[PDB]
Design a protein around this ligand. Structure first.
Ligand code: ZN
Ligand code: ZN
Ligand code: ZN
Ligand code: ZN
Ligand code: ZN
Ligand code: ZN
Ligand code: ZN
Ligand code: ZN
Lengths: 93, 93
């Protein structure tokens, strides 16, 4: 688990490309509630496997939101995993 | 909640448009594991608000998968709800 960039006691949960930062949910709230400009920053949940990279693909069959590398590694393990249909995740808010 | 169309003891959890049927998870597995043709059917989870309609839009802020009617009713209540970004939900498998 990659730690939060703006505090000490928590592991990250979200990633913001605009700030190039990995934040726990509390720090996400503290940072992007300050004003409207920050509130317009698009953020994405962290990968649920490695928890070190922004999530990029949602697989409902796996019930998992994974980053690019983890998506490729999970769905190259065998022909059953390959058949899984994944949907790209988009940053929001 | 809407009952499962193929059994009497469970509430539905998914909707299959190809079968025009609301199904619980047990009956979903029973119906679509019958053969390679039925296994291709794409199914979607049931709306989390009304629990009677197929989910059409995912809202991460509300942490909710809603049908079109529930989506509009939730996100037209006030200008704060209107700001929520929702993504279309795609049936899978
Ligand atoms: Zn933090
Ligand atoms: Zn930011
Ligand atoms: Zn990952
Ligand atoms: Zn998968
Ligand atoms: Zn059933
Ligand atoms: Zn079906
Ligand atoms: Zn509904
Ligand atoms: Zn919402």
């Amino acid at each position: 688990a990659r730690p939060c960039d703006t505090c000490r006691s928590n592991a990250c949960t979200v990633y913001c490309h605009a700030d190039s930062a990995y934040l726990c949910m509390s720090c996400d709230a503290q940072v992007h509630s300050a004003n409207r400009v920050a509130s317009r920053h698009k953020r994405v949940r962290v990968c649920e496997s490695c928890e070190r990279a922004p999530a990029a693909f949602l697989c409902e069959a796996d019930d998992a939101s994974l980053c690019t590398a983890c998506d490729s590694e999970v769905h190259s393990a065998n022909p059953l995993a390959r058949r899984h249909q994944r949907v790209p995740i988009l940053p929001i808010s």
